[PDB]
Coordinates of C-alpha atoms and ligand atoms in Angstrom, one line a residue:
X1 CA 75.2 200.6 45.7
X2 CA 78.9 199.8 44.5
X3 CA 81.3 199.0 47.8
X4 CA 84.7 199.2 48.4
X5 CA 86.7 196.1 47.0
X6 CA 89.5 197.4 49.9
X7 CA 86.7 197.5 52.2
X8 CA 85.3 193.7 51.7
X9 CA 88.8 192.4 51.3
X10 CA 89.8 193.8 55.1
X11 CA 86.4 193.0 56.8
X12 CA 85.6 189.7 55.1
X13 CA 89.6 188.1 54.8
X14 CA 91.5 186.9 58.0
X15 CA 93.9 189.5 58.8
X16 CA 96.9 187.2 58.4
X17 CA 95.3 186.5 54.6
X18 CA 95.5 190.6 53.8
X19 CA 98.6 191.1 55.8
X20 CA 100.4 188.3 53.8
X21 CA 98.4 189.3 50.1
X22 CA 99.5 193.6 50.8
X23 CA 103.6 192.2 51.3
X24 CA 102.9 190.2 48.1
X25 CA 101.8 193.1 46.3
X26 CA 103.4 195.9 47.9
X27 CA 106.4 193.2 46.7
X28 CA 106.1 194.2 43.0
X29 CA 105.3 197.4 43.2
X30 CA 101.4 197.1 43.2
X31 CA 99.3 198.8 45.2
X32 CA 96.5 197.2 47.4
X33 CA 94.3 200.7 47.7
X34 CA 94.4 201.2 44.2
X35 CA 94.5 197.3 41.8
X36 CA 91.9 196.2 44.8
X37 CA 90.6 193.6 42.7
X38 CA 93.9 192.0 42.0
X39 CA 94.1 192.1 46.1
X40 CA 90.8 190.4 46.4
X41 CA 91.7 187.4 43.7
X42 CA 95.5 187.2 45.7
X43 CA 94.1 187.1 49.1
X44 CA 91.7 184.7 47.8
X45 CA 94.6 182.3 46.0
X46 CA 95.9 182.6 49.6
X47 CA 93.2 181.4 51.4
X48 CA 92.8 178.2 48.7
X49 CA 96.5 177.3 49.3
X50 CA 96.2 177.3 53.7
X51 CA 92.5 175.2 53.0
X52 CA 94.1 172.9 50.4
X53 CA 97.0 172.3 53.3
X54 CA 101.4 166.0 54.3
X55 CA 101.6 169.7 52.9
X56 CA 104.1 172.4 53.1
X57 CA 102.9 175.8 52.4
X58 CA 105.2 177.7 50.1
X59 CA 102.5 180.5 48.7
X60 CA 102.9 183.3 51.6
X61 CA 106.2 183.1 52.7
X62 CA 108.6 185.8 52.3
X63 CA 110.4 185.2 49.0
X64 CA 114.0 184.2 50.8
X65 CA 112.2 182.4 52.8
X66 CA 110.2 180.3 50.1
X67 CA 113.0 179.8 48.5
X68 CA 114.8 178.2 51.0
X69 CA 112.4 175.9 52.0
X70 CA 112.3 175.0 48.4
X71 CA 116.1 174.2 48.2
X72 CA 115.3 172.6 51.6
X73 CA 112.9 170.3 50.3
X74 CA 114.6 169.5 46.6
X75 CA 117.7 167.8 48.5
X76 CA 116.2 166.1 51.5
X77 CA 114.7 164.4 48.4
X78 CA 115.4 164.4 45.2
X79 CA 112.7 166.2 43.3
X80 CA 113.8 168.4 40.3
X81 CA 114.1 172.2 41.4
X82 CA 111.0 174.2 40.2
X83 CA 112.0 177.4 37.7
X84 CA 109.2 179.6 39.1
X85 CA 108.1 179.4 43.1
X86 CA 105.4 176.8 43.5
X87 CA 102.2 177.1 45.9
X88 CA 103.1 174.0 48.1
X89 CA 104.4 170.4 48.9
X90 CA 102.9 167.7 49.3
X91 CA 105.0 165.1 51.3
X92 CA 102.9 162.3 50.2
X93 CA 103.0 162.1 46.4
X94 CA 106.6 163.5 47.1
X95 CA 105.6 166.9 44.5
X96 CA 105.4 170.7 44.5
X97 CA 101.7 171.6 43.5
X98 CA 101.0 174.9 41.6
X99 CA 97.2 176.0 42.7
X100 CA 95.3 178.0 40.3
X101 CA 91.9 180.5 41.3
X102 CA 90.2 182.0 38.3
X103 CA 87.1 183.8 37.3
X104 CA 88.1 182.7 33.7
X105 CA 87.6 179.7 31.9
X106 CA 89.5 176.6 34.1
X107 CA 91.2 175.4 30.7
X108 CA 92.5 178.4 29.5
X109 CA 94.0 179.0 32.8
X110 CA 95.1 175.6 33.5
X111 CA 96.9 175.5 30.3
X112 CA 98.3 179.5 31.3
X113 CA 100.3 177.9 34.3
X114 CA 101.4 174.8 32.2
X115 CA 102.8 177.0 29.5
X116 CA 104.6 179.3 32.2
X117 CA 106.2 177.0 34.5
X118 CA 106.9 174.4 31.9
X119 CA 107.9 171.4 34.2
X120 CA 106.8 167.6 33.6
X121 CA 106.7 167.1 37.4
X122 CA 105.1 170.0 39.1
X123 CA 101.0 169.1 39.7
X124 CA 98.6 171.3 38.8
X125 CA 95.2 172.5 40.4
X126 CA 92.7 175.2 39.0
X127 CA 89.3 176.2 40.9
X128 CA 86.9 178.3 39.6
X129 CA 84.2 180.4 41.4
X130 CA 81.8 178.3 39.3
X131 CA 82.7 175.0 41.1
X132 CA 84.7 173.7 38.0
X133 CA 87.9 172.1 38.6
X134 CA 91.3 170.7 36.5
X135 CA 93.9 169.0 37.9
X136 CA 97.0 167.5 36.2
X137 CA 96.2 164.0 34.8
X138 CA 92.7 164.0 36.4
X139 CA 94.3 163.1 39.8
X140 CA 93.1 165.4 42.2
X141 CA 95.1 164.8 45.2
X142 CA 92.2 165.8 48.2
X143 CA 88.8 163.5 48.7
X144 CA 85.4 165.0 47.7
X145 CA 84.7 167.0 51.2
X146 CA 87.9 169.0 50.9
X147 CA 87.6 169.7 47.9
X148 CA 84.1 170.6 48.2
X149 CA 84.7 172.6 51.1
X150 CA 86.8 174.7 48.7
X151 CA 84.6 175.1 46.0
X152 CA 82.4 176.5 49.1
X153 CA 84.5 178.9 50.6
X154 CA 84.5 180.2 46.5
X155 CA 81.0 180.8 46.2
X156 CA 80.7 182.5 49.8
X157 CA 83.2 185.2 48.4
X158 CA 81.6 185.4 45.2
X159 CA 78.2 185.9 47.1
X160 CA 79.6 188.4 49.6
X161 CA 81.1 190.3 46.4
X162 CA 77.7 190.5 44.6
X163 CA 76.2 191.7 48.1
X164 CA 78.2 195.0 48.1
X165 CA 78.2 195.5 44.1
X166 CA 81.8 194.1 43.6
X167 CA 81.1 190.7 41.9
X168 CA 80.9 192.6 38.5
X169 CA 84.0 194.3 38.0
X170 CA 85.8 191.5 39.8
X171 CA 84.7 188.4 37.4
X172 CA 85.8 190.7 34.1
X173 CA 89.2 192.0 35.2
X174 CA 91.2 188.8 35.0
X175 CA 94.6 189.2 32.9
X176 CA 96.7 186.4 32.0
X177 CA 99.8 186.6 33.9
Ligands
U5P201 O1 101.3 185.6 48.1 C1 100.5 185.4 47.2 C2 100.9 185.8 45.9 C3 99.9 185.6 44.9 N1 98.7 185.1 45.2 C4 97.7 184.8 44.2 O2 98.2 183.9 43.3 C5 98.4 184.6 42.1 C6 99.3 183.8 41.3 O3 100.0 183.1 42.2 P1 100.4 181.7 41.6 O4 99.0 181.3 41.2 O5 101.3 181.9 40.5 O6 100.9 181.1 42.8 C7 98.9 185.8 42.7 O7 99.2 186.8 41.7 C8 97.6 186.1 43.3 O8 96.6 186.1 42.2 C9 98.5 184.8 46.5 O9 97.4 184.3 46.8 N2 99.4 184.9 47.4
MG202 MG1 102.3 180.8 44.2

């Protein structure tokens, strides 16, 4: 049988996770009932940035919000302003970190966010649902076990996807952005 991507994403997401991915969407004009796999990979993106999180969580927020706490941050340091809304801070290495969830290849995508937010300072990290990871400069910020625990949490959806028939369509419908 073929599930309900809607269905999995409600029963098998925290509730804070959908809640937070349906604003995001319902945001630019998308709609979670209908581009359900897009809602899967965003709530999914979501739950990477709280586990990844020393941090500030940026990914989530209300848009005004995230903002502000960007401007916040950029003058109680010193930190050059990002052009496009990063995923978090990180209070330790004193950067914003642009985190990156794809069912394509981790290059192509890792080069995608490069290209697009075109800053020398912002770090970036890409997991895949096949364990591979890239990280800006080869420094990847959490120890083995976090990031690990990660790449676990990946598989776990990917399984739970295949369980219900939804793994399929979800691993070939990936756009660049
Ligand atoms: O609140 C959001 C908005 C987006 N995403 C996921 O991250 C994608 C790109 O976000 P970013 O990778 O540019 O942060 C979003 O389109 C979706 O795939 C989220 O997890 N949470
Ligand atoms: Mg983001």
């Amino acid at each position: 049988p073929l599930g309900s991507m809607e269905d999995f994403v409600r029963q098998c997401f925290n509730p804070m996770i959908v809640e937070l991915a349906e604003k995001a969407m319902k945001e630019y004009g998308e709609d979670p009932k209908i581009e359900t796999n897009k809602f899967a990979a965003i709530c999914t993106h979501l739950e990477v940035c709280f586990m990844y999180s020393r941090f500030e969580i940026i990914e989530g927020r209300d848009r005004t919000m995230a903002w502000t706490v960007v401007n916040s941050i950029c003058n109680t340091t010193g930190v050059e302003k990002p052009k496009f809304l990063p995923d978090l801070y990180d209070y330790k290495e004193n950067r914003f970190i642009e985190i990156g969830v794809t069912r394509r290849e981790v290059h192509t995508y890792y080069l995608e966010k490069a290209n697009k937010i075109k800053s020398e300072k912002t770090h970036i990290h890409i997991f895949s649902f096949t364990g591979e990871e890239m990280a800006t400069k080869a420094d990847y910020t959490l120890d083995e076990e976090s990031r690990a625990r990660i790449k676990t949490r990946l598989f776990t959806i990917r399984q739970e996807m295949a369980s219900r028939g939804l793994w399929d369509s979800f691993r070939q419908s990936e756009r660049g952005e």
